[PDB]
C-alpha cells in the first residue's frame, strides 16, 4: 500500500543508506554526527555521538560490531550495547564505508590519502599512502588484493601485507570504487573520460574512451557487459 | 550575394560561434581541441592546442587576450600572437564561455560544480560552490533490463539491446541508484522528496512524500519494510 | 575485447555563462535550481530557489529586474534583493533566455512550443504557438519585428501585436537565434546543414548549404561578411 509504518527522526539530513543487523535493529548515520541504531518499531536502542557528519553506511562485522566512518577523521567500531568499542584516527575526513575482509581485518580510505587496514582489537595493522584523497570503497579481490583508486589518478593493487602488488596511472582522479569482474578483470572509470580494464598482474587490458568524467562504478551484466554512466550524458554498454 | 568567400577546414564539428577580434581576426573553437585565429582572406594566422573539444565560444578582454575554456578542464588566455599567457586548471570540463569583470576578473563556471573568478594575472581569486548535478551507478534487474537515474529527473528502462523500455518521470533529479525488491517493484527517491514505487512495466504502484530530497538507496527488510533516510532529517519505514 | 555495443543519452545537464550585474553582482543558474547572486568578493548575497535546473543565463532590465527561466516551467522576475516580484507558468521547461523589447515587453520561448510576451508587470500580453519547442532566445528588429526560430522547423516573424508577420520554412529544427544584418537580412542557421539569408518579407534571399547541421548563431563582419560554424567541420565566410 505504500503506507507509513513510523519514522525517525535525527537532527539533521541523512545522506547514506541505512543498514540491518541480523536482528533487525536498524543503522543510520545522520549529518548530526550520529550514528543511531533502531529497534524494528522505531523506538532508539541508542545513539552514538561522533564529532561531525556522517557521510557513508555503516558496516557490520560478523560478530555484530558496527563499523561507521565519520567526517571527524576517525573510524568509529561500537558494540552492540551502544559503548565504544574503540576508535581509529585518520588524519582527515573519512567519505565511503569501511570495507571487512575475510579474517575481519577492516579496511579504510581517508581523505588524508592512506588506505588504512585496522585489526579487530582496533590497532593499525598497517597504512599505505597514495598522492591524494581516497573517495570511494576498496574492493577486495578473491585473492586478498585489496583494489582502492585516489584522486592521484592511480589504482592501487595491495597485498594482505601492506605492500603495493602494483598501481595503474590514469589521467586524472579517480572517484568511484573499481568493480571484478568473473575472471579477474578489475574494470574502473576515471575522470580522465576512460573506463579502464586492467588484468590481474596491473597491465592495461583495454580502455574504452568517453567524452567527460566518469563518476560513478560501472556493473557487470549477466552476460559480461560492462555498463557505465559518463559525464556526457550517455550510459555505455561496452563488450569484455 | 551568397556566394562562398572563403572555407576553413578544422578536425570536427564546430559547436559555438565565432568571435572577431578588434583587428578583423576571427576566432573560433573547434570540437579537435584547437582554438583557430583566422585572418580575413582565410588563411590561418594561428592555432592553439587545448588538450580536449571546446562547446563554447571565446572571449576577448579589452588589451586583446583570448580567453576560452576547454574540456581539458583548463581555462587558457591567450595572447594576440597565439602564445598562451596562463592556464588555469579546474577539475572537469568548461562548457560554457566566460565572462569578464569591470576590473578584469574572468568568472568562468566548471564541471566540478563551482563558478572561478581568475585574477588577469592567471591566479585564483576564488570559487563558489553552485552545485554539482550527481549520477549513481546503474542496476539490472534479473530480466536483463537496466536501470539508471538521471539529474533530468527520469528513470530509464533500457532494454539488453538499448531500446528504451520505458521511462518513469519524477519531479527533480535522482541522486541514488534504485533498488528491486523481491516481487519486482523498482524503488527509487527523487530530489523531488518522494520514493517512488514503480511496477515492472513502467508505471506508478505508490509515491510516499518525505520533506526533502531523497540522496540515498532505499533499503528492504527481510519482512518487506522499504526504509529510506531524506534530506529532513528522517529515516521513514513503509509497507511494501 | 573492449568495443561498444551501444550508447543511450540520459540527458546531460546543461549551465550557462554567469551574468554581471552594473553593481558588480555575478549572477549563475545551476543544476540544483537555484539563480546564485554572488558579491564580487566571492560571498553570497542571496539565492532563489526554483524548482528545477536553470539552463540558460538570467537576463537584467534597466530597472534592474532579474529575469530567468527553469525547467520547472516559469520565467522568473527577481527583485535585486532577491525577493520574488512575479513568476509566469509556461507549459514547459523554458530552454533559452529571454529578450526584453525596448517598450519593457518581455519575449521568451518555451518547449511548450509558445513565444510568450509578458508585461513587465506578470500579465500575457500575448503567445505565438509554434509546432516544436523553441530552443534558442528570440532576437527583435528595429521595425519592432520579433523572430523566433523554432523546432518545427520555420523561422516566425511576428508582429509586435502577435500576429504572424510571415514564416519560413526550413527542412530541420532550427537551434541557433537568427542574426539581422544592417540592411535588415534575417540570417538563420539550420539543423539541415543551410544558412538561410531571408528578406524582410519572408522571401528567400539566398541559402548556402554546409555538410551538416549549424548549431551556432552566425556572426557579420564589419564589412558585411557572414561568418558560421559548421558540425561538418568547417568555418564559412560568405558574401552578403
Given at each position: 500500500?505504500?503506507?507509513?509504518?513510523?519514522?525517525?527522526?535525527?537532527?539533521?539530513?541523512?545522506?547514506?543508506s541505512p543498514?540491518?543487523?541480523?536482528?533487525?535493529?536498524?543503522?543510520?548515520?545522520?549529518?548530526?554526527?550520529?550514528?543511531?541504531?533502531?529497534?524494528?518499531?522505531?523506538?532508539?536502542?541508542?545513539?552514538?555521538?561522533?564529532?561531525?557528519?556522517?557521510?557513508?553506511?555503516?558496516?557490520?562485522?560478523?560478530?555484530?560490531?558496527?563499523?561507521?566512518?565519520?567526517?571527524?577523521?576517525?573510524?568509529?567500531?561500537?558494540?552492540?550495547?551502544?559503548?565504544?568499542?574503540?576508535?581509529?584516527?585518520?588524519?582527515?575526513?573519512?567519505?565511503?564505508?569501511?570495507?571487512?575482509?575475510?579474517?575481519?581485518?577492516?579496511?579504510?580510505?581517508?581523505?588524508?590519502?592512506?588506505?588504512?587496514?585496522?585489526?579487530?582489537?582496533?590497532?593499525?595493522?598497517?597504512?599505505?599512502?597514495?598522492?591524494?584523497?581516497?573517495?570511494?570503497?576498496?574492493?577486495?579481490?578473491?585473492?586478498?588484493?585489496?583494489?582502492?583508486?585516489?584522486?592521484?589518478?592511480?589504482?592501487?593493487?595491495?597485498?594482505?601485507?601492506?605492500?603495493?602488488?602494483?598501481?595503474?596511472?590514469?589521467?586524472?582522479?579517480?572517484?568511484?570504487?573499481?568493480?571484478?569482474?568473473?575472471?579477474?578483470?578489475?574494470?574502473?572509470?576515471?575522470?580522465?573520460?576512460?573506463?579502464?580494464?586492467?588484468?590481474?598482474?596491473?597491465?592495461?587490458?583495454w580502455r574504452?574512451?568517453?567524452?567527460?568524467?566518469?563518476?560513478?562504478?560501472?556493473?557487470?551484466?549477466?552476460?559480461?557487459?560492462?555498463?557505465?554512466?559518463?559525464?556526457?550524458?550517455?550510459?555505455?554498454?561496452?563488450?569484455?
Amino acid at each position: 500500500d505504500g503506507t507509513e509504518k513510523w519514522r525517525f527522526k535525527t537532527g539533521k539530513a541523512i545522506e547514506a543508506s541505512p543498514v540491518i543487523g541480523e536482528d533487525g535493529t536498524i543503522y543510520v548515520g545522520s549529518n548530526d554526527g550520529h550514528l543511531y541504531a533502531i529497534n524494528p518499531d522505531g523506538t532508539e536502542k541508542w545513539r552514538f555521538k561522533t564529532g561531525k557528519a556522517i557521510e557513508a553506511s555503516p558496516v557490520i562485522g560478523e560478530d555484530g560490531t558496527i563499523y561507521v566512518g565519520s567526517n571527524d577523521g576517525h573510524l568509529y567500531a561500537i558494540n552492540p550495547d551502544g559503548t565504544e568499542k574503540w576508535r581509529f584516527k585518520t588524519g582527515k575526513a573519512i567519505e565511503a564505508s569501511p570495507v571487512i575482509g575475510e579474517d575481519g581485518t577492516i579496511y579504510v580510505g581517508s581523505n588524508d590519502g592512506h588506505l588504512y587496514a585496522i585489526n579487530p582489537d582496533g590497532t593499525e595493522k598497517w597504512r599505505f599512502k597514495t598522492g591524494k584523497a581516497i573517495e570511494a570503497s576498496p574492493v577486495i579481490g578473491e585473492d586478498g588484493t585489496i583494489y582502492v583508486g585516489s584522486n592521484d589518478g592511480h589504482l592501487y593493487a595491495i597485498n594482505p601485507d601492506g605492500t603495493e602488488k602494483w598501481r595503474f596511472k590514469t589521467g586524472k582522479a579517480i572517484e568511484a570504487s573499481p568493480v571484478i569482474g568473473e575472471d579477474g578483470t578489475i574494470y574502473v572509470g576515471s575522470n580522465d573520460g576512460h573506463l579502464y580494464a586492467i588484468n590481474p598482474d596491473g597491465t592495461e587490458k583495454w580502455r574504452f574512451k568517453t567524452g567527460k568524467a566518469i563518476e560513478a562504478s560501472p556493473v557487470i551484466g549477466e552476460d559480461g557487459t560492462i555498463y557505465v554512466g559518463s559525464n556526457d550524458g550517455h550510459l555505455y554498454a561496452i563488450n569484455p
